[PDB]
Design a protein around this nucleic acid. Structure first.
Ligand SMILES: [Mg+2]
Ligand SMILES: [Mg+2]
Length: 101
RNA sequence: GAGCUGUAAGUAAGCUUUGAUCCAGAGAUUUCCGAAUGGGGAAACCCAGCAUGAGUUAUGUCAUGUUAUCGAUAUGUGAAUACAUAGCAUAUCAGAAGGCACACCCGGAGAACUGAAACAUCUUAGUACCCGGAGGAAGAGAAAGAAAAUUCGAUUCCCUUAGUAGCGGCGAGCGAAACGGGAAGAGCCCAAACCAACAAGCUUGCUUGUUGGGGUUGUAGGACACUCUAUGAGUUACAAAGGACGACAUUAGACGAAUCAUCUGGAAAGAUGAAUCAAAGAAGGUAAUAAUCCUGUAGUCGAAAAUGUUGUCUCUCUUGAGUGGAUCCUGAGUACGACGGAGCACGUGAAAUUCCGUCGGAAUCUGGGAGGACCAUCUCCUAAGGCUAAAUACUCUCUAGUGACCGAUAGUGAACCAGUACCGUGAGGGAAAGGUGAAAAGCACCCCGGAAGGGGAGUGAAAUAGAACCUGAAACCGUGUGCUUACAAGUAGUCAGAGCCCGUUAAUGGGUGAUGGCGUGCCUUUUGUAGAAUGAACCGGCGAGUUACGAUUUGAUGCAAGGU
RNA sequence: UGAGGGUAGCGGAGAAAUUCCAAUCGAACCUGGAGAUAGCUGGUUCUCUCCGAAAUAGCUUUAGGGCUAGCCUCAAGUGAU
RNA sequence: GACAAUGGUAGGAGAGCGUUCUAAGGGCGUUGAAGCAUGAUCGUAAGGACAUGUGGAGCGCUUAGAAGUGAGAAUGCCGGUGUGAGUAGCGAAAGACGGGUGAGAAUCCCGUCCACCGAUUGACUAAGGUUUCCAGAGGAAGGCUCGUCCGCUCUGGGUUAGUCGGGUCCUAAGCUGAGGCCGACAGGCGUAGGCGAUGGAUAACAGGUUGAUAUUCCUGUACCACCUAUAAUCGUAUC
RNA sequence: AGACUCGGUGAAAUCAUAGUACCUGUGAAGAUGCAGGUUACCCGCGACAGGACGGAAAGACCCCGUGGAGCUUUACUGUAG
């Protein structure tokens, strides 16, 4: 449904109305990671070798039914359908009709 | 069709768009113990034999291969005893054993307390235990039958007959069947009389010994006597047993319609507004309550393959009736009777029909049996050989799905890695356990401390949710404060009431109590309890007239000489 | 007195006491029939309104139990008995 | 609106509140439900609301249905907490001091003096237990107090055989048993052969060493079984 | 040696709520709790044993149950041999 490399649009969250890209999708818990969306402030272990007494800020994963794949030819995040006469499913946006990648 | 390396968190070193992980079918590997099977044993271990093979100049040491016991086909081979037979030595042999679903079924054996208000015949009960046999079901089965009509035409299971006929220290209690309505519904193979061969008789025998042909019943049917047909008919679930070609079902899987913006919020699925799809408003999750966000549902769609169910195509195999009447056949230590027991609903009773142990013991179609002792005529039926599907009883399991069923003392003993800690020499007994948050963002850094544990700062909607982690009751232990008590005899309350400190759901209010009157706790069992008669330390959970099939009366309601 | 063994519950063993057989023996322990049976004891949970008894007779393998009669209760019927 | 009735145990009759669940109609809820806590309120009784606090997502009302439908007692059953009470105990028995160690010492380690067993409270091996043994770090629990200590927790280590005790050797009591003999089934007995040491047979002794092993490891000298080369060889020798 | 004051750890049987006096009476006939009187300021610690019908074991004796069991005989009915 949603994979890494394509834009999204958060529809339901504290950081809604924000585009971005997918970083890494947890497939079992159905959670995706988008940059700049639901960022943390981790109290890191400053006895680690890397830093000197600080607070990390890495993005936190959101569930896959909070992003929605967009093709703004009519300024709209759409849903996905599947067409194939080529031996492999080419992904189709049903609300506009164009072939996306 | 892009992330994966079981719990997996944590790092390490990697693999994958030349399709990895993950899912389904089919083949490969499957150490040692176990029926244990080369011998031994205190299971999971110890000792060997004969063949081929490595190794060493050679023994020691290793790998593969086999070798249990009965049975029954075989080949030998001397039997005590000449012939020859029980013994013995070998080749083979998907032959056998044990495990179970503690369920259902059929046989062998087979109790007790209990009910009878004691108890022995009897009932509990042919039940519980135990032992043997199997099956996907098993058992019964093709009338020596029911029955009294101008009879119908195997068995099995449900409804009714009926708690009626009966049996019963005639006590307690046990308790049918046929008729009638149904679920299901097919019937067939031998033995004998006999004809033909081959090993023993001139033998007298087609009969005996073997093997093929014949032949199956009561309206009496077959040997034998005669003609008139000889290709259509098949089953391998009964009746004899050996293959292909694609239809459909199962174990992976794919597609699958339609919502946008504001208010409160940490977050929209919510209320207020406009839109839409609907053979799809079942259900679950997503930062709260979603027909339209996700996984899906109604509907279509899909098999390289391995089983499974059937259609028709082979292919195997097969004679079908009638009339006659002379002769032969139609299951023998069988049927049945006396003595002793069992079982039929029926307890030796006048006791039929059915099987067991012991002795007696038949008739042969003008025969033999039954119709509840028995006998006589009318009536149905053919005993002493065997094999048979379905309707029926179950559930350790696999897949979809339901519930006026439970919600952590509940429902399984068990939601936690349960028949596990732990108790017992042994068989055997057997509990305790669940919840951070939407997301680990699980408390960086300073400070008292040896550390625990704290208090700030920080993440978070809230840590007064910090792994003693949701809400947090009472008992019981504390710290604070308004009234009060050190001359009094108290089931601790009640009614009358000064003085003091307060100010509610606003009504002739609340807390405290100097002094006066009355007043011997609560249940349970008793003629009668303050009782020195019984029970409870306290607080919290759990903890007892229920359901079924009948009976009778009452209330309702529908019809009413008819109801159902 | 050590070590390895044998006898088992209708039964073993007993220089004999009803003695011992896994801290129990006038007949062991464990699961099953079994939720055995009990005329005998304890227990039996919400509230108000109306009426309100008996502890006697007869028979009992009966005497602290039972059945009918007596006394209470609710509804129908005769209707001053 | 008159006149009437109304103590009550066994027991008969009537009328109601409440709890979980389902069906139908209507409704509140993150501008905060259930649950819990405080209150001076309402009804003839069981019982009903409402007002602030804590709580964080589901719950009541009207009519009818169906019950695992109501707890003060059963020497009731599981869980919690008290009174007895800071009471009875602390499990035979000789300790005293100087030094270190430590946040902390009558208790731990080292030293001197003192006492106790000495046919044993000493030294080796069977039975049984199964890591306890040993060095380095620990102080929450266990130890009848304390603890720096440990038979308790974490990490890393420890058991060497031709000759000792067993097996490749033998048989007692007993056990099992090819054929066989008996028995409703299960199964009981038993001949040849097997199994079975607490017994018979059976070739190695001193000294050294580790933080933990020693007839096992290595120092010096041995011995029994087997195999291969071998020479003096004896020959129907011999097995 | 235990007890007794101090330092360390720290149980148990028992228990309806307790601010828990005596005398002669009454009473289920033996009263801390009732009636009438008399003494009695509030709270501890060491002792003793008259009472709380003191604590522990649903009397252990004796009647009762148409309860159970073991043994016994010329009780009844059976059975191994
Ligand atoms: Mg049977
Ligand atoms: Mg008293």
């Amino acid at each position: 449904h949603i994979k890494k490399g394509d834009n999204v649009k958060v529809i339901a969250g504290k950081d809604k109305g924000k585009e971005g890209k997918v970083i890494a999708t947890l497939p079992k818990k159905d959670r995706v990671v988008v940059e700049g969306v639901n960022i943390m402030k981790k109290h890191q272990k400053p006895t680690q070798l890397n830093p000197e007494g600080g607070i990390l800020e890495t993005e936190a994963a959101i569930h896959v039914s909070n992003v929605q794949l967009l093709d703004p030819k009519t300024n709209e995040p759409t849903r996905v359908g599947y067409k194939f006469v080529d031996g492999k499913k080419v992904r189709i946006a049903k609300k506009s009709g164009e072939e996306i990648k």
